[PDB]
Design a protein around this ligand. Structure first.
Ligand SMILES: O=S(=O)(c1ccc2nc(Cl)sc2c1)N1CCC2(CC1)CC(NCc1ccc(-c3ccccc3)c(Cl)c1)C2
Length: 329
């Protein structure tokens, strides 16, 4: 069978807490009054929810409402619990209330309101310094949630929100997040394809917070190289080929060895044989101003098949890539 794995950091953090903290199945939900909020306009449709801008008529404060589509109550209790646990944390979205339509029986999450600067405007103006800063800001949120025994499992640009006018960032969409418990086997059918770690793709279920660090590298790549998505797999199998065509098949077979992982008979056809490529080959004139020795060192140390050899969030925050941003503090 597969070799076990535990987290190198924040391993026993949920164990040292009361059971209620992570036994979300037991959480009873504090309902608010739906008539305190009126919906203004729709902001987005999104697989598990629809998102609206609303006003709280109690204090005339602008708000965000995610009306949920039908999920199991235990997954809602999960998200609510994780949000409540992380509330007040750096760059974590703030849950403000929870309400149910007394007729449709549909439940709705009410959030603080953050203006998103227009994608086009932001993307075209970004700058290396800006990327550094906002990555630092994402790392802050991740080290916080990891320290609080929680893995997001859906880190990607969709779930990051930036108000550039106020240099303000939030990490959202906590509905796939789970509590890390050593020895636990998780579902590998999580996150979107382009951001899935190797461990999900080879079906190693004793994963941990380091899953987030892979995605974060997947994010950094697309930004510095200006290629979204960076690993563009046609299906879950081809996603690992895309990764192997860059990272090389050798470190991959070394990883499945160390963890005595059994590859579906399929991959053993498509994976083939692939040298580990150098980053220079994704550099061109239009991205060079984002790419730097510091950045490629940072990226290399996140994009590793072996989850145990990835940088932790706190080590990442200590990386030379962010030396300038930390001095502003
Ligand atoms: O209208 S929504 O559905 C909405 C509105 C309010 C709301 N409030 C709660 Cl509560 S949930 C909710 C949902 N919608 C807004 C727009 C998004 C999707 C959701 C977030 C945007 N993020 C793109 C992005 C992320 C990171 C970077 C980046 C920049 C520099 C270094 C690294 C990364 C860049 Cl360049 C771009 C796309």
């Amino acid at each position: 069978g597969p070799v076990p794995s535990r987290a190198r950091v924040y391993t026993d953090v949920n164990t040292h807490r009361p059971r209620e903290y992570w036994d979300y199945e037991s959480h009873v939900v504090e309902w608010g009054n739906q008539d305190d909020y009126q919906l203004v306009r729709k902001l987005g449709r999104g697989k598990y929810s629809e998102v609206f801008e609303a006003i709280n008529i109690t204090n005339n404060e602008k708000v965000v409402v995610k009306i949920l589509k039908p999920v199991k109550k235990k997954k809602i209790k999960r998200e609510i619990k994780i949000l409540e646990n992380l509330r007040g944390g750096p760059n974590i979205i703030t849950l403000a209330d929870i309400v149910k339509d007394p007729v449709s029986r549909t439940p709705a999450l009410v959030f603080e309101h953050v203006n998103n600067t227009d994608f086009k405007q932001l993307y075209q103006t970004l700058t290396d310094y800006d990327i550094r800063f906002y990555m630092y800001e994402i790392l802050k949120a991740l080290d916080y949630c990891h320290s609080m025994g929680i893995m997001h499992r859906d880190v990607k640009p969709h779930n990051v929100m930036i108000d550039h006018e106020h240099r303000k960032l939030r990490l959202i969409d906590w509905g796939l997040a789970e509590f890390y418990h050593p020895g636990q086997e998780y579902n590998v059918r999580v996150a979107s394809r382009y951001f899935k770690g190797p461990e999900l793709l080879v079906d190693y279920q004793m994963y941990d917070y380091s899953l987030d660090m892979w995605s974060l590298g997947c994010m950094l790549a697309s930004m510095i190289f200006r290629k979204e998505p960076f690993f563009h797999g046609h299906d879950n199998y081809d996603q690992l080929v895309r990764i192997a065509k860059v990272l090389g098949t050798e470190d991959l077979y070394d990883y499945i060895d160390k963890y005595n992982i059994e590859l579906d008979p399929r991959f053993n056809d498509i994976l083939g044989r692939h040298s580990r490529k150098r980053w220079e080959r994704f550099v061109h004139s239009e991205n060079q101003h984002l790419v730097s020795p510091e950045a490629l060192d940072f990226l290399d140390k996140l994009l590793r098949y072996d989850h145990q050899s990835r940088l932790t969030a706190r080590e990442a925050m200590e990386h030379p890539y962010f030396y300038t941003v930390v001095k502003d503090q």
